[PDB]
Amino acid sequence: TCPFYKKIPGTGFTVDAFQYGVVEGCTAYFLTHFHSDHYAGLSKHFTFPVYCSEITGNLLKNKLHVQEQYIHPLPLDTECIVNGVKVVLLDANHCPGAVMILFYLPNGTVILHTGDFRADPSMERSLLADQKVHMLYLDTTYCSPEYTFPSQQEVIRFAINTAFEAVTLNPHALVVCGTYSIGKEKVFLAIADVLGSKVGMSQEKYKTLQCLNIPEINSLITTDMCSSLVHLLPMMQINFKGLQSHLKKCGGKYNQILAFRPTGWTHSNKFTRIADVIPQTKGNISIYGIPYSEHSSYLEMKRFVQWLKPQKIIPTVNVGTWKSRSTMEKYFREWKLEAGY
């Protein structure tokens, strides 16, 4: 059944709750972003109102074929009324079109649901600065102190310099980047840009990117593989077998592959620095795992929460085990005692 952490008290609203059939009492289904664990269950057959960002609305229409009459896109940073309740969508700094949702309850309670986010100090100067938030439904993906990772900017710098050096040394080297969802487009666009190439991809992936309101996107991507030297492939295909295979497909236009697998966290983060990353190599194939995250580090999450000072925290990630729940609750208490709320 729909878990309690997907329901917004005192409303008929749910958040990211499309896989339980009809939720008894739900008058409006919010969708924070277009990632499959969150939209799971939507299709052209859905007949309830869906409230989301414009970009999430483009993907619902074009990729899932949800009918236009049930998609209700809202602008960001704008006070809007939904079934008698004031809401605001804020940028979540996750994947394109991802939002956090502020709910102003008729009784005076204010609730923030983060969806998936990567906390940033810039959020301390949004509409959130303007009033008190009583309850926080928090993306707790990396809520443990071992989870450190570099800034997105540092990681992109590393990938750009790596690619540029490799291809300038060998102009017959191919660059490949893995993907399985929207998010992390900066990785392959920044690389293609330093190389003066467009990025080449399947028709399905190109369609997906064309939904995202990226400026000058027609100048940066293409479905013609042969004219591009940065290829996107399914993350599954980023391994020696899948890459050798792929190299045969290019017909002797290339004799070397340099591949990037933009992972979440991986345990080499607890030892090694970004300047010190190395690839796995077999022959003329090298694979780099780079820690490009679209979720808060532990420290970034801690800062955000200690700034917001919520009265109650409801985790939405890692809630399935008593040991994770108990550990998260201990961090929340430490934070509260250190900061004095």
Nearest-approach distance from CB 136 to Ni ion, in angstroms: 18
Could you tell me the two tokens for 137?
Answer: 């439904």
Q: Using CB under 5 A, which of the segments 113-121, 145-153, 224-232, 317-325 binds Ni ion?
A: 113-121
Sequence-distant (≥ 6) Cβ neighbours of residue 317 within 8 angstroms: 139, 140, 141, 143
Q: Minimal distance in Å, beta carbon 115 to Ni ion? A: 8
- Does 116 engage in binding with Ni ion (CB under 5 A)? yes
Q: Which span sits near Ni ion by CB under 5 A: 51-59, 114-122, 203-211, 216-224?
A: 114-122
Under rule CB under 5 A, residue 113 binds Ni ion: no
Tokens of 236: 């599954």
Residue in this structure with the two tokens 């800062």, named with its chain if needed: 303
Residue 16 binds Ni ion, judged by CB under 5 A:
no
Contact criterion met (CB below 8 Å) for 158 and 274: yes
**Minimum CB separation from Ni ion for residue 181, in Å?**
8
Q: What angle do CA 160, 262, 60 make, to 5 degrees?
A: 110
Separation CA 17–CA 42 (nearest Å): 10
How far, in Å, CA of 212 to CA of 54, rounded? Answer: 9
With CB under 5 A as the contact rule, which of the stretches 55-63, 78-86, 109-117, 203-211 interacts with Ni ion?
109-117
Torsion of CA 67, 70, 71, 77, to 10 degrees: 170
CB of 58 to Ni ion, least distance (A): 17
Using the minimum distance from each CB to Ni ion, give the nearer residue, 277 or 317. Answer: 317
Least CB distance to Ni ion at residue 216 (A): 26
Assess 35 for contact with Ni ion (CB under 5 A): yes
Using the minimum distance from each CB to Ni ion, give the nearer residue, 35 or 231. Answer: 35
**Could you list the residues that contact Ni ion (CB under 5 A)?**
35, 116
